[PDB]
Amino acid sequence: MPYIEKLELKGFKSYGNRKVVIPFSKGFTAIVGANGSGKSNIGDAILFVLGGLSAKAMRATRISDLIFAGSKGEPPAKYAEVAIYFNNEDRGFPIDEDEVVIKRRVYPDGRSAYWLNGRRATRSEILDLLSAAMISPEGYNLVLQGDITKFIKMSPLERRQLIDEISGIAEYDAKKEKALEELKQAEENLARVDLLIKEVKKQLDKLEKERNDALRYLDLKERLERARVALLLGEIKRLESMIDEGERKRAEIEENTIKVKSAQLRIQLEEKRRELKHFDAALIRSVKEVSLDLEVLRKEIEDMEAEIKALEPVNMKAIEDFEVVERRYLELKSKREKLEAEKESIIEFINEIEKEKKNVFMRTLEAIAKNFSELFAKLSPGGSARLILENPEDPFSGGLEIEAKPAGKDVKRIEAMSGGEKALTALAFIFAIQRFKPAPFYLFDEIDAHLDDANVKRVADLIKESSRESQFIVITLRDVMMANADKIIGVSMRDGVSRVVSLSLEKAMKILEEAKK
């Protein structure tokens, strides 16, 4: 994780127009000074520079009254400006730099302005990058005045969400979401195929009926034509036994009426022979070998011609149209089943994600609860306390509550915490998370305001131990807290401005027992 190398104020609250550079130990730095030395405005500075639009939380009546209103010896500032410098040699910030520098400036008409590493940035870019570096998750690591009370009135449902962040389930939620995209696509496709199958299946059945009519029209057509060739082979045998004597009548009846109609008998005859010279040989022989009797053939032809007139109209495209629509039918039935299997598969995957997600949540949730127990016993010896999941089966729709028991005292949920018990509990929680997933820094202004000495000593020890992996910036006036800091920054007021001096254990001792009279 990154960490604050220093902080610069120009024109900010109680600090003058002079730029002010506040350097920070990588571990435990302690801001100390008397009531109203303005030591706490440094906390407010940090919230200001992290894009805090909080107004009340920066303890200015309005956004513009974060600006030096002027003092006896210095003119009012033209604006308020804070620059914060992070060491990024670990690349917690998605920036290919080891120093990420964020400067924010607010003008008297309320407008702000940001910069990372000198280029103008918008607020959503500063915010999204501070999130990527998990700087201040829900601001749990920024504990300003009144935050403990805000955290105690906090609902269980409001408490879980920070555990989600810490556990890091977002990566599973990104996968799940693309899985649900593909599932959505999968069944709209699937629904398209269903609508195509319904029409195609109905079109196919028109075509089955037309196909079959076209087929029997075909059969009738063919029988009708062989019968036509049949009636015709007979039609000359008869006409052949006719002219055998129908022109033999000539040399018997004499005045050439018999020459004319026997030239008719020969004139119909000739051509109803040559007519079959033009019929195919396969047809002519698949009939040359069946019946005769001419008038039954003409009655039967008249019939066959009639039931052809029945079926009409027929659509002969149907015979080929059928095949094509049936292939389309069988393929839609094929596609559907593959779509439907694809859908089921996506569903199984989406269920794998949720259960992975939940496991990561519970593993995180249980680690922190173990930690929470220990540390609270450490701050209130002989005591214990418990994190409680509201919905053990679907944690993501439940809240998360706390219950504590101080040694020989009554079990209370966080709702009903009041004295410094409220504070020691809030700090067990905070430290529980910090041992699982250290934030880059923690900011503690006051929080010792309501603990006795024996308490503040264990907190300072706890802070001192944890600083081996996290940065601690504690704004205090209690000597025991001062005692373990690696660095002490002093903050005092002369003639209406605040000043910061890089101090010393016993110097700070002196100044903070002289001011206590």
Author numbering: 1 to 254, 907 to 1169
From the article:
Multi-subunit SMC complexes control chromosome superstructure and promote chromosome disjunction, conceivably by actively translocating along DNA double helices. SMC subunits comprise an ABC ATPase “head” and a “hinge” dimerization domain connected by a 49 nm coiled-coil “arm. The heads undergo ATP-dependent engagement and disengagement to drive SMC action on the chromosome. Here, we elucidate the architecture of prokaryotic Smc dimers by high-throughput cysteine cross-linking and crystallography.
To understand how the Smc joint connects to the Smc head at the end of the Smc rod, we next solved the structure of PySmcHd-CC80, a Pyrococcus yayanosii Smc head attached to a long coiled coil that includes the Smc joint. Based on sequence and structure comparison, we mapped the Bs Smc cross-linking efficiencies onto PySmcHd-CC80 (right). Remarkably, these residues form a straight line on the surface of the molecule, the presumptive 2-fold symmetry axis of the Smc rod. We then manually aligned two PySmcHd-CC80 molecules aiming to minimize the distance between all cross-linkable residues. The resulting Smc rod fragment shows an intimate association between the two PySmcHd-CC80 monomers with little steric clashes. While the Cα-Cα distance is relatively large (>20 Å) for some residues, indicating that the model of the PySmcHd-CC80 dimer is not a perfect representation of the structure of native Bs Smc-ScpAB, overall there is excellent alignment of most pairs of experimentally identified Bs Smc axial residues.
